[PDB]
């Protein structure tokens, strides 16, 4: 058995579905059977958060959650606390976390100290991925995360229709964003670069600068090449209404 589903109860929190994947490199992973068992069988619009971690973006996440609610979109992140959780819980949004099982901790009952890599309350579905040797690190789950996103957007094969729209939101609050951006560009997916992280602020600043004035101090050369090849959209706002308008636009229309 390549995967096993569980009911996961967050301490003082919601009941989630937790799926352990025992081999992330398994050829032809049975996503159809997995998603049928989770009742995730419709095609859903997807908002994928790239490099999501704990950040001071509170009102921005309220706008993002509103746009996802109005579009019936599933949010996909890295299963750790981001500050989106209160808005997701209140609106009954589907929040899907994908993480390596070895890189995350299970929440402790009545713990006075939250670990920054603890699974956050608000996730409705958790995908904990492993290799055979249980040595998986951050970025190695990224291929599984994108394949899951593509299958969630396609839904059941019997629905003859185009897949639902997928938008990526580059937060870059963690340094491990590069592999996920590389895969998003490879699948021709739109990427919203959101203000608030040092990496995103540098990208936005350099997008407005003339070529001769561009200074890259934090962004790797590979990311600079990806910015020319991919569909990147700069959001120089932390306003809840501006992110909601961007997400709603990209979930409804493809501008390229």
């Amino acid at each position: 058995q390549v995967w096993k589903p569980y009911d996961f109860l967050f301490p003082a929190g919601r009941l989630a579905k937790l799926v352990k994947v025992f081999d992330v490199y398994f050829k032809n992973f049975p996503f159809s059977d997995l998603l049928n068992k989770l009742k995730l069988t419709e095609g859903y619009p997807i908002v994928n958060l790239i490099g999501a971690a704990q950040s001071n973006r509170g009102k921005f996440y309220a706008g993002l959650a509103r746009a996802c609610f109005n579009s019936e979109a599933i949010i996909v992140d890295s299963a750790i606390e981001t500050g989106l959780e209160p808005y997701v819980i209140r609106r009954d949004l589907k929040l899907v976390g994908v993480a390596p099982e070895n890189c995350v901790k299970y929440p402790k009952i009545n713990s006075t100290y939250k670990d920054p890599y603890e699974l956050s309350n608000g996730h409705t579905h958790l995908f904990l991925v492993n290799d055979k040797d249980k040595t998986l690190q951050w970025s190695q789950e990224t291929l599984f995360k994108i394949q899951l996103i593509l299958k969630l957007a396609e839904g059941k094969v019997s629905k003859k229709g185009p897949r639902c729209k997928i938008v990526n939101v580059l937060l870059a609050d963690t340094p491990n964003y590069l592999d996920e951006v590389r895969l998003a560009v490879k699948y021709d997916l739109p990427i919203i670069v959101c203000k608030g992280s040092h990496i995103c602020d540098e990208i936005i600043k350099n997008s407005k600068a003339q070529e001769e004035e561009k200074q890259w101090n934090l962004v790797d050369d590979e990311m600079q090449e990806l910015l020319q090849k991919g569909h990147f959209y700069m959001l120089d706002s932390l306003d809840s209404e501006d992110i909601a308008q961007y997400i709603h636009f990209f979930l409804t229309f493809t501008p390229y």
Binding site: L9, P11, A12, I109, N110
Partner: protein, 49 residues
């Protein structure tokens, strides 16, 4: 009469045997209940944190 005396002896022994076993059985039954209760308690204390 010898047969009747032997029946009376066997009935006395059987009545004596029939008391104590029931008492021991009640104590054995008396445990198990604590384990079931304690398992329910532990599950619910875990749910309540």
């Amino acid at each position: 009469i010898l047969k009747k005396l032997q029946e009376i002896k066997v009935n006395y022994e059987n009545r004596e045997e029939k008391k104590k076993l029931e008492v021991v059985k009640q104590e054995q039954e008396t445990q198990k209940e604590k384990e079931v209760l304690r398992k329910q308690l532990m599950r619910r204390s875990l749910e309540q944190g």
